[PDB]
Amino acid sequence: PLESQYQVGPLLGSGGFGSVYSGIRVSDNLPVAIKHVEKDRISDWGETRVPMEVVLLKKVSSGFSGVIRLLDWFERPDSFVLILERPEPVQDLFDFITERGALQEELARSFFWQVLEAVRHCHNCGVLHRDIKDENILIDLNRGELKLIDFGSGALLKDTVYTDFDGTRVYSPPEWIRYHRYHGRSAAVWSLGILLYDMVCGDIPFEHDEEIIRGQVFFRQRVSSECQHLIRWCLALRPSDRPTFEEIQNHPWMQDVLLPQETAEIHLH
Numbered sequence: 094p095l096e097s098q099y100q101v102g103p104l105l106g107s108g109g110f111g112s113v114y115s116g117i118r119v120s121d122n123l124p125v126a127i128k129h130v131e132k133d134r135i136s137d138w139g140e141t142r143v144p145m146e147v148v149l150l151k152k153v154s155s156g157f158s159g160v161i162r163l164l165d166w167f168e169r170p171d172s173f174v175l176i177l178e179r180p181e182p183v184q185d186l187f188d189f190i191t192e193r194g195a196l197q198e199e200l201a202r203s204f205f206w207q208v209l210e211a212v213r214h215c216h217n218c219g220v221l222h223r224d225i226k227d228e229n230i231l232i233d234l235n236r237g238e239l240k241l242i243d244f245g246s247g248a249l250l251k252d253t254v255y256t257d258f259d260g261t262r263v264y265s266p267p268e269w270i271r272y273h274r275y276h277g278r279s280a281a282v283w284s285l286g287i288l289l290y291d292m293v294c295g296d297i298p299f300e301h302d303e304e305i306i307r308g309q310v311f312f313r314q315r316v317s318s319e320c321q322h323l324i325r326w327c328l329a330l331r332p333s334d335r336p337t338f339e340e341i342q343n344h345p346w347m348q349d350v351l352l353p354q355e356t357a358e359i360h361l362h
């Protein structure tokens with residue numbers, strides 16, 4: 094009877110993922126997030142038959158704080174209720190970039206690095222997010238830690254080809270736009286490339302399908318040669334020409350990353 098262990102609060106947000114309410118867990122007054130999803134609105138299920146999002150979060154919710162952990166969940170007549178952690182204060186990368194504009198490379202380095210550790214975490218756990226982007230990245234302003242959210246478009250990690258994709262088009266790779274097919278790890282790397290550009294330029298690089306398939310990336314902001322190189326590498330047109338997570342984390346631009354707390358005092362506090 095979820096309607097007792099938690100006390101609902103204001104509506105944090107809503108959209109193509111459901112409706113999320115701020116809440117508190119009467120038992121330790123733990124700040125939580127309560128997400129509602131209508132059964133009629135989901136297409137992927139796994140296992141009892143629960144929405145894929147729950148299966149994904151469960152395999153990924155133990156320990157490492159790179160992803161928002163799923164604390165619990167309940168089933169209702171026509172929907173599922175998810176109890177997620179809720180850091181405070183917090184701000185998603187989209188709003189953060191929208192307010193501060195392009196990020197200094199030291200900050201983008203720390204942020205990108207943490208996203209990479211989080212993505213490696215999910216992959217290691219057999220989960221592919223499929224919708225990595227600013228909006229799905231939460232920033233814990235006080236600890237300087239980022240956390241991944243909304244695995245609603247995710248899928249179990251597999252080595253074979255994918256033929257479905259309901260993520261964010263502007264963050265989709267050329268192979269999806271042209272052949273309606275892609276592979277997990279390399280598609281993920283491509284979106285990682287869009288994200289990085291978004292961070293240091295303050296906006297995504299491609300708007301139209303033609304631009305995505307063209308691959309030419311123009312910089313509207315001043316960014317180091319090393320950063321431009323990593324970005325271009327992640328955005329290689331041919332999937333196999335993209336770097337592996339290891340190659341990204343070993344890239345020259347990725348060295349000397351700040352620690353989360355250091356990031357918070359220098360850039361967030």
Ligand SMILES: Nc1ncnc2c1ncn2[C@@H]1O[C@H](CO)[C@@H](O)[C@H]1O
Pocket residue numbers: 105106107113126161177178179180183184185228229231242
């Ligand atoms: N687990 C969560 N904890 C805190 N806030 C969240 C969580 N999931 C979604 N949100 C809020 O809802 C918005 C929807 O993208 C996010 O920007 C964030 O503000």
